[PDB]
Design a protein around this ligand. Sequence first.
Ligand code: MED
Ligand SMILES: [Ca+2]
Ligand SMILES: [Zn+2]
Ligand SMILES: [Zn+2]
Length: 277
Amino acid sequence: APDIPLANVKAHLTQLSTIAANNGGNRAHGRPGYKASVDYVKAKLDAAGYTTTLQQFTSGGATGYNLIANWPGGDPNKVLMAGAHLDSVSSGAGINDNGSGSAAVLETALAVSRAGYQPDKHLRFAWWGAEELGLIGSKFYVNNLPSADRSKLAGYLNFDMIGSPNPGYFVYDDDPVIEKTFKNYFAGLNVPTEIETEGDGRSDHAPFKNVGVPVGGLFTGAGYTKSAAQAQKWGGTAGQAFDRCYHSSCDSLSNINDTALDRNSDAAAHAIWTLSS
Ligand code: MED
Ligand SMILES: [Ca+2]
Ligand SMILES: [Zn+2]
Ligand SMILES: [Zn+2]
């Protein structure tokens, strides 16, 4: 897999920050900052050769969108998906939650095109709307995915909060092959990982997991406090939240740990390459 350039991931975050500023301070469902975020991500993917779909839904009386991007080619019967919710809460720009995952998935998708990669499995990326309303966009996608297509899914990889400023390195303990692939990447860096427990089912992998699609993912922690043992293994500040700006107006460009964002973006690309061969 290629390295994912940290600077490129950061640049997507800068664009999402500007989009929030230009649209009332947020990128929330039903608010213009969300659709503007969609439009930015879609234009990059379209230019790189993806077949994109804007999947519309209505929730709370307002139109929402999922952005689906299919890389042409690969076995239609073995589809590997990766995704990240693209909405924020309305209090702020949602740069760690979840600009970070959205930007890593976008830069990985662009990396596939730059590398001229032809995965054996068909790749499909997704940016979900309205996750902050209760996984509404990913539930909509799974609920509207025919059973014949659901059975073609080899896996769904989720990236939701991967740049926390006081990070942990959490890997979902779900499908064994997906989990092993992420933990192998971190082992190559000599960075230990822990099982994800803080967020559990509270992200867009849940609708997939609940219908038997193998899932996995990466997370760097939210409002829980980093323990003494976690600060010893990862650095940072024991006794402070992983993300002191969770769901806050201060979830801005200053609310990112560059090392965590880099490591998790690189691990996302590593897993996508390994699991699509
Ligand atoms: C990764 S599970 C934590 C859920 C948090 N991202 C949220 O979007 O509210
Ligand atoms: Ca990198
Ligand atoms: Zn999130
Ligand atoms: Zn959130």
